[PDB]
Amino acid sequence: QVQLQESGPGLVKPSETLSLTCTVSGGSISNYYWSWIRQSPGKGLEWIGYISDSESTNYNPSLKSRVIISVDTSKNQLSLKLNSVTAADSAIYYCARAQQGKRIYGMVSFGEFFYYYYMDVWGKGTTVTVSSASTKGPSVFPLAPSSGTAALGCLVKDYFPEPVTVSWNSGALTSGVHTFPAVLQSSGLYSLSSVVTVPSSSLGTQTYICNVNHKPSNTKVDKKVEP
Amino acid sequence: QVQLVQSGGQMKKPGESMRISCRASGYEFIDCTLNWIRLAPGKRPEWMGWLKPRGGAVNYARPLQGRVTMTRQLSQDPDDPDWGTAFLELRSLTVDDTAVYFCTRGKNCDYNWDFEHWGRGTPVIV
Amino acid sequence: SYVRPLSVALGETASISCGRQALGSRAVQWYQHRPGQAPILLIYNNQDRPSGIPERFSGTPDINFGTRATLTISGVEAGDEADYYCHMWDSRSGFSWSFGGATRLTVLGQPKAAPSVTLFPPSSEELQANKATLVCLISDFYPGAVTVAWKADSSPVKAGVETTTPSKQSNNKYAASSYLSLTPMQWKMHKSYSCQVTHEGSTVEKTVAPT
Amino acid sequence: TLQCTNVTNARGELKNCSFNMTTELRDKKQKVYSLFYRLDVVQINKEYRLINCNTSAITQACPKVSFEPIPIHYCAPAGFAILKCKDKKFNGTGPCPSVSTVQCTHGIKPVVSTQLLLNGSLAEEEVMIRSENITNNAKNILVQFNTPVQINCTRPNNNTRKSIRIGPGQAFYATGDIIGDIRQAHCNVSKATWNETLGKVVKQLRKHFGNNTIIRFANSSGGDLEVTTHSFNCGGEFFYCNTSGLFNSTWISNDSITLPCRIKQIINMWQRIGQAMYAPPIQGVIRCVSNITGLILTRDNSTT
Amino acid sequence: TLQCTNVTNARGELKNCSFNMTTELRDKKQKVYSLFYRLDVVQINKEYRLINCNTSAITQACPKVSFEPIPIHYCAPAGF
Ligand SMILES: *[C@@H]1O[C@H](CO)[C@@H](O[C@@H]2O[C@H](CO)[C@@H](O[C@@H]3O[C@H](CO[C@H]4O[C@H](CO[C@H]5O[C@H](CO)[C@@H](O)[C@H](O)[C@@H]5O[C@H]5O[C@H](CO)[C@@H](O)[C@H](O)[C@@H]5O)[C@@H](O)[C@H](O[C@H]5O[C@H](CO)[C@@H](O)[C@H](O)[C@@H]5O)[C@@H]4O)[C@@H](O)[C@H](O[C@H]4O[C@H](CO)[C@@H](O)[C@H](O)[C@@H]4O[C@H]4O[C@H](CO)[C@@H](O)[C@H](O)[C@@H]4O[C@H]4O[C@H](CO)[C@@H](O)[C@H](O)[C@@H]4O)[C@@H]3O)[C@H](O)[C@H]2NC(C)=O)[C@H](O)[C@H]1NC(C)=O
Ligand SMILES: *[C@@H]1O[C@H](CO)[C@@H](O[C@@H]2O[C@H](CO)[C@@H](O[C@@H]3O[C@H](CO[C@H]4O[C@H](CO)[C@@H](O)[C@H](O)[C@@H]4O)[C@@H](O)[C@H](O[C@H]4O[C@H](CO)[C@@H](O)[C@H](O)[C@@H]4O)[C@@H]3O)[C@H](O)[C@H]2NC(C)=O)[C@H](O)[C@H]1NC(C)=O
Ligand SMILES: *[C@@H]1O[C@H](CO)[C@@H](O[C@@H]2O[C@H](CO)[C@@H](O[C@@H]3O[C@H](CO[C@H]4O[C@H](CO)[C@@H](O)[C@H](O)[C@@H]4O)[C@@H](O)[C@H](O[C@H]4O[C@H](CO)[C@@H](O)[C@H](O)[C@@H]4O)[C@@H]3O)[C@H](O)[C@H]2NC(C)=O)[C@H](O)[C@H]1NC(C)=O
Ligand SMILES: *[C@@H]1O[C@H](CO)[C@@H](O[C@@H]2O[C@H](CO)[C@@H](O[C@@H]3O[C@H](CO[C@H]4O[C@H](CO)[C@@H](O)[C@H](O)[C@@H]4O)[C@@H](O)[C@H](O)[C@@H]3O)[C@H](O)[C@H]2NC(C)=O)[C@H](O)[C@H]1NC(C)=O
Ligand SMILES: *[C@@H]1O[C@H](CO)[C@@H](O[C@@H]2O[C@H](CO)[C@@H](O)[C@H](O)[C@H]2NC(C)=O)[C@H](O)[C@H]1NC(C)=O
Ligand SMILES: *[C@@H]1O[C@H](CO)[C@@H](O[C@@H]2O[C@H](CO)[C@@H](O)[C@H](O)[C@H]2NC(C)=O)[C@H](O)[C@H]1NC(C)=O
Ligand SMILES: *[C@@H]1O[C@H](CO)[C@@H](O[C@@H]2O[C@H](CO)[C@@H](O)[C@H](O)[C@H]2NC(C)=O)[C@H](O)[C@H]1NC(C)=O
Ligand SMILES: *[C@@H]1O[C@H](CO)[C@@H](O[C@@H]2O[C@H](CO)[C@@H](O)[C@H](O)[C@H]2NC(C)=O)[C@H](O)[C@H]1NC(C)=O
Ligand SMILES: *[C@@H]1O[C@H](CO)[C@@H](O[C@@H]2O[C@H](CO)[C@@H](O)[C@H](O)[C@H]2NC(C)=O)[C@H](O)[C@H]1NC(C)=O
Ligand SMILES: *[C@@H]1O[C@H](CO)[C@@H](O[C@@H]2O[C@H](CO)[C@@H](O)[C@H](O)[C@H]2NC(C)=O)[C@H](O)[C@H]1NC(C)=O
Ligand SMILES: *[C@@H]1O[C@H](CO)[C@@H](O[C@@H]2O[C@H](CO)[C@@H](O)[C@H](O)[C@H]2NC(C)=O)[C@H](O)[C@H]1NC(C)=O
Ligand SMILES: *[C@@H]1O[C@H](CO)[C@@H](O)[C@H](O)[C@H]1NC(C)=O
Ligand SMILES: *[C@@H]1O[C@H](CO)[C@@H](O)[C@H](O)[C@H]1NC(C)=O
Ligand SMILES: *[C@@H]1O[C@H](CO)[C@@H](O)[C@H](O)[C@H]1NC(C)=O
Ligand SMILES: *[C@@H]1O[C@H](CO)[C@@H](O)[C@H](O)[C@H]1NC(C)=O
């Protein structure tokens, strides 16, 4: 079918161009409508704008003085460039395909219809935080167990900004994994703590390595875990 | 097209009072006399009293005198001027007053006691 | 956008009424939006659903004008807790740019679950890096509201502790971390450190010593 | 002085006007509002005013009298008589061969119509056309169908009527708001029935103009609103139906034609200059079913 | 709008109402007063108004016609 995936800087300084892109899968770009949506913490969903299968522009007047939704049909990629960003522009940006419906209530010739739009398939989301503070990489410190069933994990200390992705054995170990929500310390850096439940038989020895990725810092660090 | 519309049901307690309406439509309100009939299970249908909108002249039944009061309120706007609202008030309620109260009208305005038209009923539980 | 509360029981029926009633012929969209997650299209045309939505999600069609648009959830689950939006399109009002308000459905009467505290001592790499950190991991508790208290040997700490707000899990339970950043000398000069997690009724304790 | 806006939509036809209106007390005013079709108002220089103010007074129709045509029978007094004419191909003038007498005429329905005669009496046998002198172009030709063409009309908007006390017993009935959708008042005819009926009319038209000449149909050429459009009454409101879709066929040798109709409340009727009537709005959705039985044509220098 | 008081006494029945009334000139008013029995007036919320205003118009009886019942004879036409 059709699936999407966004990709953005994740951190843009105030009063700057918030560039973004979204590549769709298993579908043609020039025969569907596409909508951009952002959702801030504490605020409801906000409809950015939408582009047609004829590549027509129409933005929310709450934002139209700053948005420009482009699209390039050579691939399945369409962009989104908000500029003059402020602190209120921190939100998750979802890439959804709009589909055009024509609600007819009277005579079609007299123009007694109105057009409604519904998004059926959505993207996963890309977190974009705005702050004058620069980027910052993490630093993984392992957590060893201490002997039936035991638990082990990786401490992802001070990093900025959200988020980070945690894999175990590059993706093989996926049962019992439990990545925890981060904590914004008063110093301004998030701290995430992953943990995996493991049978006590494999403690000696089944090699366990946690994979930590933080895209705003171009880092990919790993570390072992052993008593 | 004679149609009598009453008010919703009410749950009262002994000592309180009630007020129910009966909006008629489809005939000259001041020409035909209206009545009020209560219907309790296991009892005879009791006639409370009739009211003539021409001046509001009323006649109460003896077992209800002093506790029953019937009024009217016909609209004074000649566009829909064919409708009145007969109100019924029963004070010092007892558990024996629990029934379904109807407002009736004769088949014609010459003879009043041939109740051809009935309201949907206003159940009261004391 | 502000949020409208709602409280239904597990297995009962819900009636999420739209907050912006229509003026003419309506074409309402319903979205299930879990916080910090991709929304789900429940109903796009007044009564029509997409492929992959249970029958227990029904939308009211406008055949006679007057019937307001409401979302009916029959046989609610614990996983049905999310936000719900009424995207109201009608012939009188113009272009429905904004989504609905916010109906945060909270299901009452879910199974009460006890937490699972797991306290780890500081890592040797960070102790070698001249810093210490205790990680009191809590998970699989309901309702999601816990109180964390740290004790140095036997005295309360309070200074230097950060705590997660109880986020929701996949199994509809809740989890939260609990960090205590110590100096590498303060962690060695003490005998034991405990993490008192008082969830709902009574507390659970996990202790860790420097040996 | 009316303060009007457009009723929220996207063509801005019927307006939403507010005004300082008198009350039951001669020293109190009130800021009430109402809906008026644009055909009833004109601007000053936004500010509007009722169309009839610089012309004549206006009397609101009593909402208890009926606009319905009732069969009226005309009778001659004693000593007089009415002469019928049972000739089924009798054109207007000449000597009727089969004559009978009646004390009263038949049920005459005084249906006020225009261009298209509505609810009239059909003709037996074949459709005849009249006009006193058919060759005089300035004489209205009366064509009388023999089969009825069904026409359906409606004002789809669900209207509301608001009573506004403007004095001791003076209650002006205004248009409150439109419940539900806002649509367009129109009329329907069967294109097949209208095609065969326009064929029946062009049939008898050759007996007066020639078996080879062309017969062309067009819409009105100008004048007032009451003449350029099909004007009549439907449920109690006066339509003005654009008949350009009915008269557009040059003849030589499932369907549904829809006419865009407007609505007026401030009419003078007949054509008198002196008094206009305000028709109080009809509550609910309007639709009426009528037959068009006649037609009033007007020809325009060789053989076409 | 009527501005009424009680007529000085001690039951306060007939009132003493004053009002801004029109004159012979369409641009001049006048503050005249009159007595009205309470059966003819109703309050607003002291301020009063004539009872018939929210119902119908009112015509003052000509003070030259007689309210006296005169013996009227009903007769049938010829042939009856
Ligand atoms: C005088 O002359 C006049 C001029 O001729 C004449 O005017 C006519 O007036 C009437 C009413 O006054 C008008 O009737 C309306 O018609 C509307 C349009 O209907 C057409 O389109 C729809 C939708 O078409 C899409 O979907 C179908 C499948 O559903 C596809 O097959 C189509 O290809 C199409 O999909 C493509 O096109 C879309 C563009 O719209 C694209 O977006 C899409 O991507 C695709 O590319 C069809 O369903 C209709 O088909 C019906 O009729 C055919 C005959 O051709 C029959 O086989 C069968 O009965 C079909 O059902 C038609 O083709 C209607 O929308 C409207 O009815 C709705 O609106 C009113 C008021 O708003 C509601 O009260 C009513 O209940 C209807 O609401 C239903 O539908 C909406 C929208 O779908 C829902 O939101 C709503 O919940 C409700 O759903 C319920 O009912 C459904 C069935 O109706 C059911 O499926 C649901 O599950 C639910 O129960 C109304 O009927 C007419 O258009 C005028 N004529 C013209 C030419 O404009 C007048 O009548 C004359 N007489 C007078 C004045 O007396
Ligand atoms: C023709 O034009 C007239 C105007 O002359 C229109 O009449 C007005 O219509 C508007 C709506 O379009 C009315 O405004 C609504 O008033 C409601 C009444 O509440 C008032 O009173 C309470 C006290 O009980 C106050 O607290 C409150 O502030 C109001 O003063 C409001 O409840 C409505 O609020 C809605 O809008 C707000 C803001 O968007 C929302 O937050 C609310 O949730 C709610 O949805 C609204 O303000 C106005 O009262 C009408 N005026 C009169 C005199 O009636 C006609 O509608 C128009 N007709 C047509 C056909 O176009
Ligand atoms: C219904 O209500 C109306 C009021 O709207 C009453 O009408 C008023 O009645 C009062 C008396 O109750 C009148 O007041 C009297 O006015 C007299 C006229 O003199 C005026 O003009 C001279 C100039 O020539 C001025 O110098 C003088 O000051 C006045 O302005 C006065 O002579 C009266 O004076 C009396 O009282 C004073 C004070 O108590 C005494 O010292 C005097 O000796 C004297 O006894 C008095 O002031 C008033 O004028 C009336 N108004 C109108 C518009 O007519 C109705 O009477 C009342 N009806 C009922 C049935 O209740
Ligand atoms: C041409 O002639 C037609 C028929 O002779 C006219 O149609 C009539 O139009 C009037 C008003 O537009 C209608 O009166 C309406 O009545 C309905 C209620 O009627 C329904 O209920 C009664 C039961 O009491 C039932 O007997 C009827 O059959 C209906 O089912 C209301 O909406 C209003 O009160 C309104 O007055 C007539 O009903 C209607 N007659 C028919 C046979 O359809 C048409 O108006 C004429 N055209 C012109 C231009 O004059
Ligand atoms: C109602 O809508 C119509 C149509 O948009 C408006 O007509 C416009 O009037 C202005 C006058 O200021 C003209 O400059 C425009 O050219 C008109 N537009 C069209 C499409 O004709 C009308 O003004 C609106 N009325 C109100 C009260 O808002
Ligand atoms: C419109 O159509 C026809 C005109 O012939 C009328 O319906 C017929 O009326 C005759 C005379 O009353 C009846 O004998 C037929 O049985 C009727 N046909 C049907 C199918 O009912 C109808 O009354 C006309 N309406 C008018 C003139 O208002
Ligand atoms: C037109 O609108 C009126 C109200 O503006 C509708 O009347 C309602 O009818 C229902 C019955 O289905 C009653 O329960 C309501 O009480 C009525 N409302 C009022 C205010 O009287 C009417 O149904 C509408 N009709 C159409 C065809 O839209
Ligand atoms: C005008 O309206 C009438 C009534 O709605 C239509 O007559 C109906 O026609 C359909 C289709 O043949 C029949 O199924 C119905 O039984 C008819 N109604 C009645 C009451 O007999 C008529 O077709 C319409 N004509 C036009 C030109 O719109
Ligand atoms: C009646 O309808 C016709 C078309 O059905 C209208 O004709 C328009 O006339 C104007 C010039 O007056 C042209 O510019 C348009 O192109 C015509 N429209 C069409 C579709 O041909 C006519 O205007 C209508 N009558 C009124 C009074 O508006
Ligand atoms: C006229 O006199 C009567 C009787 O004293 C007044 O009636 C009183 O009205 C007030 C209203 O403010 C009530 O609180 C009192 O209880 C009433 N008294 C009685 C005995 O009923 C009336 O207000 C007086 N009117 C004027 C204009 O002064
Ligand atoms: C005109 O106003 C009078 C005010 O007295 C209304 O009469 C009273 O109305 C209330 C409730 O509407 C009743 O409780 C009183 O019993 C009525 N009193 C009298 C003496 O009738 C009257 O209904 C209003 N008329 C209109 C048409 O609104
Ligand atoms: C009514 O009169 C007042 C007088 O101040 C004026 O301001 C207002 O605009 C008037 N209302 C209308 C609708 O013109
Ligand atoms: C009507 O018929 C007579 C004779 O049958 C004829 O003289 C007269 O011209 C006809 N009327 C018209 C308008 O042609
Ligand atoms: C008549 O038709 C012509 C041509 O379509 C159009 O320009 C004109 O506006 C029409 N007039 C009327 C009154 O419909
Ligand atoms: C007459 O009008 C004036 C206007 O200033 C007002 O002060 C006075 O109270 C009015 N008179 C009455 C009796 O209401």
Numbering used by the authors:
A (entry chain H): 1 to 82, 82A, 82B, 82C, 83 to 100, 100A, 100B, 100C, ...
B (entry chain U): 1 to 52, 52A, 53 to 76, 76A, 76B, 76C, 76D, 76E, ...
C (entry chain L): 6 to 67, 67A, 67B, 67C, 68 to 95, 95A, 95B, 95C, ...
D (entry chain G): 128 to 137, 151 to 185, 189 to 309, 312 to 321, 321A, 322 to 397, 411 to 457, 462 to 465
E (entry chain G): 128 to 137, 151 to 185, 189 to 223
Can you list sentences taken from the study reporting this PDB entry?
Having demonstrated that contact with an adjacent gp120 protomer bolsters the trimer interaction of both CD4 and selected anti-CD4-BS antibodies, we hypothesized that conferring quaternary-contact capability might further enhance the function of already potent bNAbs that interact with a single gp120 protomer such as VRC01. While the binding footprints of both chimeric antibodies on the first gp120 protomer are nearly identical to those of the original antibodies, the FR3 loop-contact surface is mainly located on the neighboring protomer, indicating that the elongated FR3 loop establishes quaternary contacts without affecting the “classic” interaction. Besides contacting CD4-BS2, mostly through residue K207, the FR3 loop seems to bind residues with long side chains at the base of the V3 loop: the aromatic Y318 and the positively charged R304 and R308. Interestingly, we found that the FR3 loop-contacting region comprises not only part of CD4-BS2, but also elements at the base of the V3 loop, which form a contiguous surface distal to CD4-BS2 in the neighboring protomer. Both structural analysis and mutagenesis studies suggest that binding of the FR3 loop is mainly mediated by long-range electrostatic interactions between negatively charged aspartate residues in the FR3 loop and positively charged residues in gp120. From the crystal structure, Y318 seems to establish the main direct contact with the tip of the FR3 loop, but neighboring basic residues in V3, such as R304 and R308, are also favorably positioned and point toward the incoming FR3 loop.
